[PDB]
Structure formats: C-alpha cells, structure tokens
Design a protein around this nucleic acid. Structure first.
Ligand SMILES: Nc1ncnc2c1ncn2[C@@H]1O[C@H](COP(=O)(O)OP(=O)(O)O)[C@@H](O)[C@H]1O
Ligand SMILES: Nc1ncnc2c1ncn2[C@@H]1O[C@H](COP(=O)(O)OP(=O)(O)O)[C@@H](O)[C@H]1O
Ligand SMILES: Nc1ncnc2c1ncn2[C@@H]1O[C@H](COP(=O)(O)OP(=O)(O)O)[C@@H](O)[C@H]1O
Ligand SMILES: [Mg+2]
Lengths: 397, 392, 83
DNA sequence: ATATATATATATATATATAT
DNA sequence: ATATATATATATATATATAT
C-alpha cells in the first residue's frame, strides 16, 4: 500500500539547454583567463549538467593543480560567475575538472530522482535519494551500510530540505515492518509536519527531558536486539531477517529466547544537534556515542543534521564513528574540514548543493540535493496517516 | 495614526560630490594603487550617503587578495579612516573598493519612513533601520526575523538605533495589532516611553520586576499557542482571520483580535546579571514558539561578551545586527564573519538576514530625542495607556 | 572580573608588567609600553583609541599641606550608621 | 616564480586550580 | 573525592611575507 509517486510535483525545469557554440566560446574564454594567470590549459571535454558544467581541462606540462585551486576565486571573479569549483582529481581520467555554474539554474525536483532505476530496484529497507549528480545521473545511497550521517552547512543552504528528501526516501520505499523512525527536533520548524505517520515511535521530540529517554530506549533496544540475535546464531540484522523469512518459508515461527517476525530498521534523526547539546549536554553525549559505536549490526541508524560541527558540539568519539558526511555550504576551508576532512565545501552554491562523501573514500561526490517544498511533505504525510494509525510506544519515554 | 508631518523634514543638501571630484578621486585611487604593486583601472563610480563605492577593473593577473591586503595602506595613502574591499560584486568582473566620504550626510528618519516600502509593508512590526550603501532604504519585517540581536561597543548609535526601531514599530500600528513591554535596566534609555497605549505595564525598570514580565510573556505565548489549536490555526494572523471575518459574516466565535506583543529588551546584560539564570534560560524558552503567537524580542546589549550573548540565547535568534564594536573578538560573538569592528561608527551596522550569510552594509537612521518626545506625546494624545496587574 | 569591566567604561592603566594585564584592563594591549613613573594611557568614557596622558606628580609633603588647609576650615563629620 | 619563515585556527593530551 | 575550566605543548592545515 505504498503511496503513489504521483503525489510529487512533476518534472518541469527540463527546458534548459545550451548550444555548443556557447560552450566553445566559454571554453576559449576559460583558457584565456587562465593563461592570463600564468597557468595555461587546454579544455578537453565540456561535460554539461543541470546546475554546473564541468569544463574538463587538461593542464600543461609542469603546472601543478594547486596553481589552479589557489585562484579558484580570481578565475570566478574574472568569468562573471559566482564561484567555480576545481575538481582537482577526476577518478579514472587524467584531467582537472573546473565546474563553472550555469546562468539559469535548472532546478531538481524529487519525482525526477525517485523515478530512476537505481531507486526502483534498490533492495535496502532504508535508501536515500540524495539527488542528481553533476550530469543528471541520479545519486541514490543506502543508509543501512552508510551507516550514519552528518548534515552540515551554514544557514540557508538546504539542510532541512536535505533531511526532508532523506525522510521521503525512507517513506516511499519502506513499510512500518521494514523501517521505523525516531525524530528529535529542537527549534521545531520543519520536522513537526511528519507527526502522525505509522513509522514513528514518539511525538516530534521537543521535550528535551524526553529526548534523553528516547535515546536511552534506543540504546536499550540495541542491547535487546543484540541479545536476541546472538541467541539465534546470526551476525547482523540482515542475516536475522534472512533466518526469520526462511522460517516463515517452512511455516514455522521460531522461538523467542513463542513467535518472532521480521524486525524494523530504526532511524534516529536529530536536527540541529548544537541546540540539543546546548540543553542536554553531557547527559546525552555518551548516549549518542554509544548508539553510534555499536549500532550498525542491529539497525539503529543515526542521522545528525547540524550547523558547523566542531568538537565543541559533536565530540571526536562520535565523529570518529560517523564516516559518511555531507556538506551543503561551509564558509571557509576550516568549516569545510570540520565536516568533511577536506576543502572545497566552501566552493559551492546554496539552495541544496551538497558534497556527498561515501564511506571510506577521499573524493566527495558532488550531488545536487533534490528540492522538496513543504506542500510535497504535507501531501505525503497526510496520505500516510490515511494508511496507518499513529502507533506510538510510550514505554520509550 | 501620528502622521508623517511630525518628524524633522530632511534638510536639503545640494550634494557632497561633483563629477570632477569623483573623476579626481578615481584618478587618485588608480595612481595610489599604481604606486603599490597592483595595476588598476576604475570604470564606474557609485556614490552614497556615507560610503562611496569604486568598482575597479584589475589588470590581467591581478589577484584580489593583493588589493584586499593593500586595503589598509590605501586607507593611509588616501587620507581616510579605512576602506573595505568588496572582493566580488555579483554578475560583474570588477572588484569594489568602498571609500568613506569627507562630508558625511545624516540618514534622517523621515527620509526612511517616507520611502515607498514602509508605506506598502504588509506587517505590523517593520524595523525601518535606514539606508544602505546605494542610498536605498533597508526595511525588514520583525515577524519574519523573528527576533533580534542588536549589539555594539558603547557610542555606536545603538540607543538611537533601537529608538528608531521602536519608532518604526510604533508609527504604523495601533494597540489592537502591536503592543510593547519594555525593559530598560540602566535607568538611561527608553525611560521616555511612559504614556503610550502600546505598553502593557509601567516600563519594567526594576530588574527583579523583569522576571515577572518575562514569565507573563512565556505564559502568554504558551496560552496563545493552545488557543491556536483550539481553532486549528497556526499563526496569529490565522487566529485573526476568524475574528476579522467574524465581522464580515457576523460570527459569535468566542473563547474555547489578539495583538502582536514585542518585548522590547534593551541592554540585557544588566537584566542577566541582576537576575541570573531564570532570565538566561527564559528567552531561549520564549523564542521557540513566540514566532507564531505575536511575541517578539529586540534583544540589545552594549557589551557583546561570551557570557552575555550565550549559545543558549544566541542560537534561538539568527537575526543579528552589529555596530562599531571593539575588535574581532566581539565581532565573532555578535556576528560570524570578519569586519564588524572596522565600521565608520555613528550608526553604521552590518544587518545579517535570517536565511543568509552575507551581512548587508547598512547606514542607521538618526532620530532626535526631541522628535522622540514629540511622537511619544502624540501617541499619548491620540489615545490613553492601559496596563495589566499580574505583570508585576 | 566581568562584573568590574561590565559597567566601568572609563579605565586608567599605568605601566603593567605584561600584555595579558594590558588586555585585562583596556582590551587593547598598549599599556605595557609605558615609561613608568606616573605614565598612563587614558581610555576615555565611551570607547575609542586610548589617549596617552602623562600623569602629574604630587608629593606627600603637599597632600599633607592641603589636608591641613582643609582641616583648619572644617571637622570630621562621620555619619554613625555608615559603618 | 618558487622554496622557506612567521603568524593563526582546530583538535588532542596533560597539569593545575576551582567548584559540587 | 569527583567533574569542569584554563593554560600549554604539539601536531596538522592555511595564508602572507621574505630569500634565491
Ligand atoms: N534542492 C533545492 N533547490 C533549490 N532551492 C533549495 C533546495 N533545497 C533548499 N533550497 C532553498 O533553501 C532554503 C532552505 O534552507 P534550510 O535547509 O532551511 O537552511 P537552514 O536550515 O540552514 O536555514 C529554502 O528557502 C529553499 O528555497
Ligand atoms: N545615524 C547617525 N547620524 C548622526 N549621528 C549619530 C548616528 N548614530 C549615532 N549618532 C551619534 O552617536 C550617539 C549615539 O551613541 P550610542 O551608540 O547610543 O551610545 P551607547 O552605545 O553608549 O548607547 C548619538 O548621540 C549621535 O550623536
Ligand atoms: N609625574 C611624575 N613624574 C615622574 N615620576 C613620578 C610622577 N608621578 C609619580 N612619579 C613616581 O612615582 C613614585 C611613587 O609611586 P608609588 O606610590 O610607589 O606607587 P605604588 O604606591 O602604586 O606602588 C615616586 O617615586 C615618583 O618618582
Ligand atoms: Mg533549517
């Protein structure tokens, strides 16, 4: 009874297209305005895209890539653009990629992302339709193996819309028997509108006295599920669901060290982690650390939307266990490496232009975050409440 | 309402610049840059009230950082206080240097209200806080900020800035829409406001009488927030939709027009220290849902320290205004960038929008305390005050 | 303390022994470069650049003379309930 | 133009010195 | 007795500002 994708707004902005004459002219202009800075290049390919256009240049014989990155602001100021991003390492090809933003920004809608094959047949209970890559290819990842996340970026750069797109990716694919959310929300403006779905376990947790109890129940559920899985000769949640479905195949509900069924995939979401720490502090610090360390094999996954994550806010022991991190628009090369261990997250655009950093890879996949206005979230949540009852667990609080 | 013909009519100045003066200054800028390393060609000039912008076309190979570092030696070599380099102006190729004038002209408040946006501003709490570089008024809506973080080192137009903000709040409102509860610790500012119907109590000048008004504000926001759900509406305009259509259809809608109430918080460092924590962790309570029930704050202080503007108060209010501050140390706790102390003073600010990260150079408006007395007396003469007992 | 620096806009620092003390007083860092013996930089009411004011010398063989010139003209008036 | 030298921001780890 | 706040040393990353 999963909702129809028709509840999302249609693809409209597909009208944009640039003639190859303009690309020729702009590539020659790029070569000239670089050669005016000492570095000579040769535009090799002109790979276009929705928001940016990767002018894949071939550096000369002897020029260093740093001699290009250190002028990624002068070159931008001298091309009548906002800010160019220099992809100092293309994977596979022996080039440097300059990504000059377009004039009219083809917006990305969310039905454009979900209608893609990578989402059609993504066999995980918890996918995440992040958006389109720099060329229109959709980027769809798996929070189940991710296994956690750290949203960041300054004010007005698309963090709330990012979390919204992620949650809607959770909804259009997973029943309450395959996913089950838990949401904390200090400074409530955009997450309250999710209340009532059959995927929650609590109200929208604004009572910071009750956030601690929610996360303590989360840790307790982690412990209980580890006990229950270790008593059944398995090594993670996926193998446990395999065993229970093979049991139901033989029509035999297994023991309960009566009956056991498939277990959900908890998703603990936290918006603006800094405001939560400014209230609960050390009381819910060991809790986040302990639900981030040993809560992958169980299923309790942890999203953490935040502004600039510093060790003052998100401690090192928590960041050292959340290895997949996105960044929308930091302010400098230190606000960048606080969230992404690199630079270049300041050389972006607002309005939802993230840098997805896959787990265990030093190359941020620049992704354009899908746009989801609150009307879409409302027309999805009100359609969920029609399908299920607000199943809550007061025992959590 | 008190009409526009109650303020000082903006004195007519012929000008502070001539085309030959701008041309000579542009040539001087090019020559003083050529004496340095850079090579520069000025193409366009944009005059302004206080700061004048020179959009320069740097030569092929000139890195912007070089001019941004030569900023101070330009300030010296041009015989000015200090200039600032707008490193990237949108949609162009020219770097913008901003040179202070020699004949400052004042931003008089009638010149700010008579602007076409204040008259057309569709709200009840506009903070018409003066012109910008170009000389175009910068009017913002309180209910969308939805709170404020005015600060700046002493003698930076702060009392006058807050007075202009409050006069803007007043000038286009009645007690049925806007309403005020002022907090003036130092016995110094806002003591003039005593008899306007926009007040709910005698101006809270005692400091242990301030926790009372604060607790009443909390109770008021949290009872309006329940009264909303009693009709399913969300914002105060929504709850007003009923009672202003209950007169278009004659509807007896009862207790199952509430006005916006702007708690005017001034020099809150005092209130902080003479109360303690029951005020330190109470504005953080208000700011959460006050933005939906008319309650609003104008949090202002005259020393932005680390223990006065705390992360428990700072993070619930993203809209923040500076003035000429001591140095970068207070710049980083009243704003989040660099250049909030290098302001020409006497009203200049860096307004930071709610959903932006670039503060706009804004020239504050100057309001004569004579005209403040005049307009407060005008309000006292139009209607009459009305207070409430439990405010304590 | 923060309480003392809170509501005292006007400050006067003679030559302090280091720079941390100069920031403790003025928040400027220019008090440690004073030539001693009554030299001081005045941070005027309000704020701004600290003006340097070489203090004036008065000798304890003159404070006593002035105390005498006053004492002869009046008498100690100690309001009882102060202490 | 390109290799170093000096200042600064951020994060870790330790020793004191305060408070509960 | 046992948690915080501060100052320090040290290690990276980043620009500017001098040598060759
Ligand atoms: N995918 C997108 N495309 C275009 N604009 C977007 C997109 N995502 C977000 N925005 C813009 O960003 C704003 C929301 O930013 P937000 O996530 O609230 O930042 P913050 O939470 O830091 O204030 C919206 O006003 C919207 O216009
Ligand atoms: N926009 C302006 N135009 C002219 N003079 C101004 C302006 N803003 C401030 N001033 C001058 O600065 C003074 C305001 O000082 P203020 O910053 O209120 O002191 P404090 O910070 O101690 O309250 C006014 O008396 C006025 O003379
Ligand atoms: N105007 C002045 N010129 C030169 N020396 C001065 C002046 N004023 C004070 N002094 C010096 O200051 C000294 C007194 O300082 P002192 O009272 O010992 O300081 P403290 O009591 O704070 O330790 C005198 O020895 C005198 O020489
Ligand atoms: Mg947000």
């Amino acid at each position: 009874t999963l909702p129809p994708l028709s509840l999302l707004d249609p693809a409209e902005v597909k009208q944009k297209s640039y003639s190859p004459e303009s690309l020729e002219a702009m590539s020659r202009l790029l070569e000239i305005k670089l050669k005016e800075f000492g570095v000579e290049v040769s535009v090799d390919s002109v790979h276009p895209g929705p928001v940016i256009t990767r002018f894949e240049i071939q550096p000369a014989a002897g020029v260093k890539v740093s001699r290009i990155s250190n002028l990624a602001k002068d070159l931008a100021r001298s091309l009548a653009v906002i800010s160019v991003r220099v992809v100092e390492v293309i994977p596979g090809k022996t080039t440097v990629g300059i990504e000059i933003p377009n004039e009219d920004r083809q917006m990305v809608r969310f039905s454009e992302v979900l209608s893609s094959p990578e989402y059609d047949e993504h066999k995980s209970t918890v996918p995440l339709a992040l958006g389109h890559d720099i060329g229109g290819r959709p980027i769809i990842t798996d929070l189940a193996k991710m296994p956690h996340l750290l949203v960041a970026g300054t004010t007005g750069s698309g963090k709330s819309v990012g979390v919204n797109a992620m949650l809607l990716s959770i909804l259009f694919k997973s029943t309450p028997s395959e996913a089950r959310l838990i949401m904390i929300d200090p400074k409530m403006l955009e997450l309250s509108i999710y209340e009532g779905i059959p995927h929650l376990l609590c109200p929208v947790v604004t009572d910071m006295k009750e956030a601690a109890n929610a996360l303590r129940w989360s840790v307790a559920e982690m412990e209980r599920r580890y006990r229950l899985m270790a008593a059944m000769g398995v090594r993670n949640l996926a193998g446990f669901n395999r065993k229970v479905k093979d049991a139901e195949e033989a029509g035999t509900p297994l023991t309960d060290p009566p009956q056991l069924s498939t277990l959900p995939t908890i998703v603990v979401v936290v918006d603006e982690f800094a405001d939560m720490m400014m209230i609960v502090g050390k009381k819910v610090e060991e809790l986040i650390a302990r639900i981030a360390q040993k809560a992958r094999a169980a299923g309790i996954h942890l999203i953490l939307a935040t502004q600039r994550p510093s060790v003052d806010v998100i401690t090192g022991l928590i960041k050292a266990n959340i290895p997949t991190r996105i960044a929308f628009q930091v302010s400098s090369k230190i606000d960048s490496r606080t969230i992404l261990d690199q630079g270049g997250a300041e050389q972006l655009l607002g309005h939802g232009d993230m840098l997805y950093l896959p787990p265990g890879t030093g190359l941020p996949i620049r992704v354009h975050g899908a746009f989801v206005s609150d009307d879409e979230v409302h027309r999805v949540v009100e359609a969920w409440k029609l399908r299920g009852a607000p199943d809550y667990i007061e025992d959590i609080l």
